[PDB]
């Protein structure tokens, strides 16, 4: 499969419309106050669901 | 002595690229597609300067034909009777201010029913 002719400039700008990556799902940690991903252990204090995992 | 060739090619190409502002895509940046588009634009502009005066006359006839059929008669019987018999000599462009002054067009259209009887 060899290309007939080269791709235009706006035809490759349109193809990368759905190529973006999206913001993570993050909430605030109730202990330290930093942000952290939902349903995951905070990587700063080490606490999940009130208790401590350290 | 040696004439190497400096800053004349750049000026001669930048003139052609400044005539091509507004064109789509590669036709306003690259030299050898902008050159062909400027050549076609010259040919097209000549041909369309003749077709412009072809086209405004067929615009004027279409409005005189519509303001004449309000009274009683078509364009073909208004002109034969206006320009020929009742020898008045207004023409298609200025007899088409039936748009603005329609109560002065009817004077000219009543002075042409008198000749057709």
């Amino acid at each position: 499969a060899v290309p007939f002719r080269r791709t235009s400039k706006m035809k490759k700008r349109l193809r990368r419309t759905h190529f973006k990556l999206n913001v993570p799902g993050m909430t605030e940690c109730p202990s330290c106050g930093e942000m952290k991903l939902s349903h995951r252990v905070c990587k700063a204090c080490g606490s999940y669901n009130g208790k401590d995992i350290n | 002595p040696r004439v190497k060739g400096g800053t004349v090619t750049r000026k001669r190409r930048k003139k052609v690229l400044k005539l091509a502002k507004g064109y789509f895509g590669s036709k306003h940046t690259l030299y050898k597609v902008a050159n062909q588009q400027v050549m076609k634009s010259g040919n097209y502009a000549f041909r369309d300067r003749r077709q412009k005066k072809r086209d405004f006359r067929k615009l004027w006839i279409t409005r005189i034909n519509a303001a004449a059929r309000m009274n009683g008669l078509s364009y073909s019987r208004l002109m034969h009777g206006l320009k020929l018999s009742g020898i008045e000599v207004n023409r298609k462009m200025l007899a088409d201010l039936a748009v603005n002054d329609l109560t002065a067009f009817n004077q000219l259209a009543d002075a042409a029913k008198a000749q057709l009887n």
Binding site: L21, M26, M35, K36 | -
Partner: protein
């Protein structure tokens, strides 16, 4: 306003421009939190350039870190390095190791 540049970090610019689209326009409080939780290879490099501009702002012009916002954020490209990868029947293909310049401008809100 304050600014910070990176100048020839070793990452291709089309990959580093995906992460720069997330933090453009936001406040520097949550832009640091977005970059800590994104699993890409460009985000520990962008985070140091971002944190180095806040420190320029609050030390050289005496602003406050609570009232800052990201004004400008763009990735330019730097010089590339050309290497040679060996292929079948002696083709000797060429690999481009591309670099980039990362600039962040932070101003008052």
């Amino acid at each position: 306003q304050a600014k910070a540049v990176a100048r020839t970090v070793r990452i291709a610019p089309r990959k580093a421009r995906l992460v720069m689209d997330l933090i453009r326009g936001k406040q520097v409080g949550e832009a640091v939190s977005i970059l800590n939780l994104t699993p890409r290879a460009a985000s520990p490099i962008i985070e140091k350039v971002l944190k180095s501009a806040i420190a320029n702002a609050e030390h050289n012009y005496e602003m406050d870190a609570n009232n800052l916002v990201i004004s400008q954020a763009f990735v330019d490209e730097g010089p590339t390095l050309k290497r040679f990868r060996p292929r079948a029947m002696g083709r000797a293909s060429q690999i481009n190791k591309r670099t980039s310049h990362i600039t962040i401008v932070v101003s008052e809100k």
